[PDB]
Amino acid sequence: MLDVNFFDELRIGLATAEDIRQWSYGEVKKPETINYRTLKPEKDGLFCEKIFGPTRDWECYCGKYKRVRFKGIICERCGVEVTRAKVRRERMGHIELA
Amino acid sequence: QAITRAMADQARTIRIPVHMVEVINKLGRIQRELLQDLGREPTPEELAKEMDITPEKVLEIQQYAREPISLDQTIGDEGDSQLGDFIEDSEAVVAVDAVSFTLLQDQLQSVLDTLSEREAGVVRLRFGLTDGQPRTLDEIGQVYGVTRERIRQIESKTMSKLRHPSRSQVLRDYL
Amino acid sequence: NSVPGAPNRVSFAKLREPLEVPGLLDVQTDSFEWLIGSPRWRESAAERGDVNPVGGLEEVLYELSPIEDFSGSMSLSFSDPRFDDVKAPVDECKDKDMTYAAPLFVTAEFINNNTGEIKSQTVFMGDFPMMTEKGTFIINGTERVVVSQLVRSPGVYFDETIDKSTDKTLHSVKVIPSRGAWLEFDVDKRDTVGVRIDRKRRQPVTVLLKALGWTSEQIVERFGFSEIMRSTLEKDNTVGTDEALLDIYRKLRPGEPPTKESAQTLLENLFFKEKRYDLARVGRYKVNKKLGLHVGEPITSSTLTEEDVVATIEYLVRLHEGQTTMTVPGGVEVPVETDDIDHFGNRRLRTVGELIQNQIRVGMSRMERVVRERMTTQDVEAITPQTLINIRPVVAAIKEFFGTSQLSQFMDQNNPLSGLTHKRRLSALGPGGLSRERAGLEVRDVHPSHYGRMCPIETPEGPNIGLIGSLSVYARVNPFGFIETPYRKVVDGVVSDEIVYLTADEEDRHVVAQANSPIDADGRFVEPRVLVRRKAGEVEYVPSSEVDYMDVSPRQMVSVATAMIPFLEHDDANRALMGANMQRQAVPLVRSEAPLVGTGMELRAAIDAGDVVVAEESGVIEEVSADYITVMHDNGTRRTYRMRKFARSNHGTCANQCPIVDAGDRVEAGQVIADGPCTDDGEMALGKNLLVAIMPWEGHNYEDAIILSNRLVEEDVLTSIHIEEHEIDARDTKLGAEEITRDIPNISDEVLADLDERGIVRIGAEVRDGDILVGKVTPKGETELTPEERLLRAIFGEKAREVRDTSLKVPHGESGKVIGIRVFSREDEDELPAGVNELVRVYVAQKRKISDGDKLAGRHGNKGVIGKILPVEDMPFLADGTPVDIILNTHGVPRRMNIGQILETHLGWCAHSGWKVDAAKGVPDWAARLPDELLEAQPNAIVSTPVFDGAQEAELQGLLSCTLPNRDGDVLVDADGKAMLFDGRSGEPFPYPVTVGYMYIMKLHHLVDDKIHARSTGPYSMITQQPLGGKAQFGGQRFGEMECWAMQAYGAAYTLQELLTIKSDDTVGRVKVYEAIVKGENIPEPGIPESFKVLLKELQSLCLNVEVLSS
Amino acid sequence: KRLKVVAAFQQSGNSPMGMVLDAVPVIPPELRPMVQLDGGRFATSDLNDLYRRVINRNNRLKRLIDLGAPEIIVNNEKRMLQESVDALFDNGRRGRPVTGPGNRPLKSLSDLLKGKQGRFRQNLLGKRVDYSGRSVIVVGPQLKLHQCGLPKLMALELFKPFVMKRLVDLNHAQNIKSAKRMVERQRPQVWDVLE
Amino acid sequence: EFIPRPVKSSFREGLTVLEYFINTHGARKGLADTALRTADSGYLTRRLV
Amino acid sequence: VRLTFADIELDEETHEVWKAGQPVSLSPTEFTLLRYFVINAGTVLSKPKILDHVWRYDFGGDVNVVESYVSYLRRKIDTGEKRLLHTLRGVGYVLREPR
Amino acid sequence: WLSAASFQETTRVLTDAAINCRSDKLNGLKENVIIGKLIPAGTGINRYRNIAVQPTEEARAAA
Amino acid sequence: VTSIRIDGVLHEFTTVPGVKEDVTEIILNLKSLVVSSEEDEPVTMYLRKQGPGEVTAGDIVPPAGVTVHNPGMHIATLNDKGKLEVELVVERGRGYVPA
């Protein structure tokens, strides 16, 4: 689970609601992808920074934090976590069905 | 009302507010009407006159009205590959500029070492090389026990002497 | 020669032809004229079937009209579709990226009967794209060609099957109409007969017949002989017409409550109403001809009929009973047999006009629905046809067809032959046709009906082998889309001069003789039994007093390209196919010398390809230059022909045109005035004549490799002009407007030397890889500046450098000169796509020379790359001292069965040397049948060898025997075509004579300059971090599953791990391996590929709990 | 055939409740990128449309049940949501597939796992590879058995980092930037070290 | 099947129109079957490995 | 070497600005702000862009100082309420010519 | 199950593996290739990958 | 001869106005010129013609110390508006040397 190419086994199985919620870093509840004017991801949308990580490296939603010194501290105004934008390829979301 | 509002809200992949959807549809409708009337496609100036709005805004609306295309649609004449196989990665590391950057870092460190320790430190904490933050004149003054005016003078002198021919020639190629 | 300016080309043909080759662009031109409704097509229809001359547009307008509302008191109609003058000339449209079109107007009439109102208007239906004089369409400045396709004609088809469980013969029939619901009948393993319709595997024929209003007594009195389905009727277990309708409704329409009238109305609407089911005119004609229903009536009521249905059932039952002849009540007698689905009597040809008509029909159906809704909604007595009709669906449909459709393809113009073969080509793909994966061996096969209609030699060799072919050189398209070929007739045993065009339907009901039959020059056959084709495609010997038809001429079975292959009958089918396919890939050289040995098809192909200027009116020539030619006609007026020069074709090849006339000579109508890219003196010339020896040499020609002299590089014998265009546009962005300017931030001064004040490279400036063509800069403002970048900026004292230079640079891997620049800007009234305020295109040309790795070819499929270019001194040379120009291996000829190339070599040497048959005491026996004016040929003469009426082996042997010396008294080539060669390296004479001659060699479009590729590190894809593919990007080779299997078989694991992890996916691995490889340390350990993580996340997204356990 | 799955469920710790879903996950956005390609036009990953459809149906259903709607309307909305989920997972498995512009079916999740062009075969077993090239083949009869003739431009491009490091070591260039510049311009002092 | 009337001539002496037609029949059949066989063999060896 | 657009003519060497041809004095920060505006005529500059370039890199204050400077420059050179120093909300300021 | 899914019948194999909670030891050649670790054949065997080389004592003394 | 120059052209793929001949085919015709020079350095010779006529290798003036030997060979054909003005530079050498 540490990605060190030392894998004793690889397991598959049915995923439950609890497992899906454990995987999810947040809940997406709006069918909006990108703002048509500012070209930035919308809040709580399919590309929400708060859920999936920052779009740009070491940057919050508006720019309150823009330095590498703010390591792993979420912005109070937005709620996004200041980390490498590559985490956008790893964080997973979920939706709650009626 | 409900059907039109829902269409404006959820029709496009990129959400467009109803205030802009209405003007987009109105512009398209009267543009087609003008084309039918005239026999030729109406010019942007004519469309702007009909809108009673500026041609710049007309063109902005026209470019806003565009919709995205599928990245997985077949691009070849036959079915061989998808459009997603033809698009590069802008944010990907090029693996050569990184080497150039680290060598530039080493060379800049060496060049700063050639100068005096006081001036090298002043430049380092002024431009934020040890850490991310570039410190202020008051900060460097309070950490070095020197007047801010004197620190400004020594920084200017350090910059002028760092503009010196050999250092400039050495750093020129890294650009 | 039928051409006033035709150069003399003595022919070896023994038999004359009755009729000349028709216009090779007829298949497109006549179809488009029919679609338009031009007076020329009006006259053609008047002279041939004046019963109903109606164009495609008129037909679709009449079919759509009159649109009716629910009330019926008001209606709309369309009539009189007229055209207008074209928007702009073809050259201007091509230059300014416009569409060659013409406005279309329709007289719309709105009638109101409740009170009485007539509203007549001339509604502008849109800008209809036009077809040029060469059968091509100009769309956005590109030459597009619509290839005719082959589709099964709608109608009724019978088939026979063996169950293989009881070995019982079963018969089925399918009625398939265009744009309708299927009809199907069959006999099952038992005696039951099935009518499975719209995939409903029930309702035998009896319930359908009862629903059709037929009583049981009527059924038994009409269809009485059919005991099998009479027993089926006795086992119908469904009595009553109303019960039959109820069953049919409750099956085909589940979920709805059946009613008394709904069943009848649905049964009618399914088939007998044209609004939901209608065979085309061709389909109705085919059904009528098959069932013998109407023979002296015009085509109307395109929908199906109950009489047609019952006739089909009767045909099926009679065929199952073993009958061979049926007379339908009220119809003529017709034979009873199964129908071949691949027979050319049923495989109709949808042409350009038909495809355009179908697209117009779709657009006008959408328009009709829209206009019906609008005219229902809007108020009455205040409506106008102008306010009613909306042309958006029609224009959208025509654009959606003419662009982005696989039946409308780029007109490949590597050479005039390539263009002419792209036209008059029959495809089998696209909408309404079978797919490549869907295709089968049976359809890919060759049918005996293909003779004279589709050439069986010319076809692509790729995965679509057999799905694409070419029209026969004599073929024609009938008014119903069926391909027909001309054939002469024989009466009493004498062949007449009458010519009648026969479709494949009638050719089975006749006995066609052979083209090169031993005619007696009077009409009779000197030999009683001749070889003929019978009804079922069989070939047999039949007495001369029995045949009823004869082939017009040889080469009728062959296409236009393959007809340019000399000694074709001496070449195997596969190699001839290869040569015919490769004929269209030859690039145009700088001179394009006419071939020494050829056929008569070259002149006609060059004339009909439209790449050579011709004199439209006879007259004298006033003045001639390199750009324009002025012709002073007879009747006072004068004409000026503008001649294009170095115009880039579709595939980046020059299209230079050169005058071939003088300043005072007179020219007649149809005479060639200027030759094009691959034309010499007005005839097609795709290659050069080279002195060739066919012996092996040091292994440099091993395995199909080719050796050439350096004099071909020196004298520019094989050089081609290749022009490449580059485009860049300035477009408004959210941060402002990018501008083209020579002021590029942070760039040197030397690199800006070739840029003028405008920022565009000066015309004629030599350019190489990595240079800048257009100086364009974009507003980027500023981004995240790292501290090191801030330090660099503040130490070098750079200014704001507010903009980022995304200037146009030449692609990596080519160079050359600059021809011309076209600049488009919206500030100069030029129309551009929205958002773009400037467009610049730069033309770069390279005088590419022949080199190793380039692909040369002959006319007989003897392709080959260039192994080595030898110095002129180090090559074999004859006793006269002339070195051989090209050397080919001798092991490739006997294995591939292409002796025709050696025959061509011998004949070419004979033509080059010249000959004179010594008629001291009569002509020799072998020269008895040889035509006159061929007994004496001057050196470097040109001869024409028809593909099948060619030069015989004895005649060529005699010509080789009489081979008059070159300069002094010396016969270099002996009787059997060989000669003694001196080795250019050791100098000793070669121990045995080798064959030498003159062969036609062409340079194909497979230049190594366009195929060399290498990559160290380039771009990567987004979803997965694999490198991109193709020379458009920087590339990256595909290491596939087979390569992985080979790697595993070798047992080498480390190289496979590297090729998978640190070269493709692992980003940190790539960065670290590059850093190690530059710093000198060893390669670090590979990590986890990114594709595996992507797969893991994809599996997790599918609600699958997949994880990795370390212990 | 029933026991072969019933006993499999019984033996393991998983629960047959896994068949139904109360919540579904969303793939990371970088795995479904939306990219502004050259010319201002945008490109979506064809999965965002399915996700948007599912979100819209779920939101409408929850709004309907909160507001109070007839049971037939609620059932129709639930059926639509179920169909959207099935389309997202296996498009075209049941009924006609959901199609976008151009009458082409949208590709689903499993649609990028099966087939020759799927991820497993087209991106995992096989791969595109750097430091590689291709070109036409000619005969090399003068070479030995263990030798092949490589084009000099092709070899220069393939061995670009090697030759760059070597020429930097030989003091022909002051730094890697200058080495890259002279390699791209193909200076005469490159072939000597390339050999 | 085999056509009862064969080709009496050879490529050295040249063929006649119908002779070339039947030869083309056979050649096209072979050229299609080899193209199918390539993919079939590829599938077979993939399964085998 | 002068930077000019329409009615504004700035000479860095002599360090003066001309608006229809009379002397007019500006505070320095405003002067370099005008220099940044004129050198990028017709191209909008973002607020963080201006703050990072024309103000010091480590400006820890609040943004509206740039809007105050822009108001100063406007009331100094752009007399009327239709201006040559255009503002685009959320994107920043620019010096084009009205169309 | 990884090898089976990469081979053929991907959906069926994945469904069966998920139902049975099957586990892959990752000891196979195809799965090793997929995950990017050294294949268990040829130079991937332990007896070949875990060899240790060293200069001989006489050679080191003479060096 | 290694390099040429026509006043009215810029590259080999243009056309001189007034002459029926093309630039490329004029080059190819000039390829068949035989000369004999006595000076190793590059030497320039000139060819100027105007009016309707067939310009051959006899209308080219060679500077002293070099010799042309095939003056009857055809070069180009002009018209009333035709006007040809070319300069040929010639050097010694051996074998074949590309452009």
Ligand SMILES: [Zn+2]
């Ligand atoms: Zn924030």
